[PDB]
Design a protein around this nucleic acid. Structure first.
Ligand SMILES: [Zn+2]
Ligand SMILES: [Zn+2]
Ligand SMILES: [Zn+2]
Ligand SMILES: [Zn+2]
Ligand SMILES: [Zn+2]
Ligand SMILES: [Zn+2]
Lengths: 84, 87
DNA sequence: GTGGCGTGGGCGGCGTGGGCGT
DNA sequence: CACGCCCACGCCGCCCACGCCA
C-alpha cells in the first residue's frame, strides 16, 4: 500500500498514485470542475455530472418494483430497500 | 429484514439506513443539537427547529386551496382541509 | 369542533470521500 | 494521469402521523 499522504495530521495511505493525488485535494480545497449553470465549484468530475442532474432532471436509474426514477444508482439502491 | 437495529434494551426498532438509526438514537440520549436563537430552546432536529421558528416570525407558507387560510406547516393545512368535506 | 405545535418515522436530495475498472 | 462507475456516510428537508394542549 505505497502512496502515503504527506500531510502530517494524516497517515492515510493509497494503493495507486491517482488515489493520493485526488485525496490531496481536500487539504487544498482545490476544485477543478465548474458548473456551466450555477458557477459552483466541485472537487471531481464524476460529482459534477451527478450534480448536473440536479438542474436538468436527468434521471437514469429505476426501482425494479415501482419503476420510480433517480438521478443516481446509490439513490435507487437505497430506494429499492423499501419494498422488502 | 431492515439491517440497522437499535442496540438498546427495550427498543426492538429497525431501519433500512444508518443515518435513520443515528437520528433515532437521540431519543435515548435526550440530545438536542439544534437551537432556537430567539427563545434559546433546543431541538433534536433541524427541520422541527425550522417550523418552531415559525411560531415566532408568524411565517405561514401553506394555503388551503379551498379557502385561502394560511398555515405554518403543510400537515396543519392538510388536517384543516378535511373540514371542508364535512359538516 | 378547530387550530397550535412538539416530535418521531419514511424517505428523497444530494454533497463528497474511498476503491477501483479500463 | 483521465473518466466514470459502485459504494458509503452524513446531514438536510420534505411528507406524514400521533398525541397533547388551549
Ligand atoms: Zn491526507
Ligand atoms: Zn450547478
Ligand atoms: Zn420502488
Ligand atoms: Zn432505540
Ligand atoms: Zn424559539
Ligand atoms: Zn380551507
Amino acid at each position: 500500500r505505497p502512496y502515503a499522504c504527506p500531510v502530517e495530521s494524516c497517515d492515510r495511505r493509497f494503493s495507486r498514485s491517482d488515489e493520493l493525488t485526488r485525496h490531496i485535494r481536500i487539504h487544498t480545497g482545490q476544485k477543478p470542475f465548474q458548473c456551466r449553470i450555477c458557477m459552483r465549484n466541485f472537487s471531481r468530475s464524476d460529482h459534477l455530472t451527478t450534480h448536473i442532474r440536479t438542474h436538468t432532471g436527468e434521471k437514469p436509474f429505476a426501482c425494479d418494483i415501482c419503476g420510480r426514477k433517480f438521478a443516481r444508482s446509490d439513490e435507487r439502491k437505497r430506494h429499492t430497500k423499501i419494498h422488502l
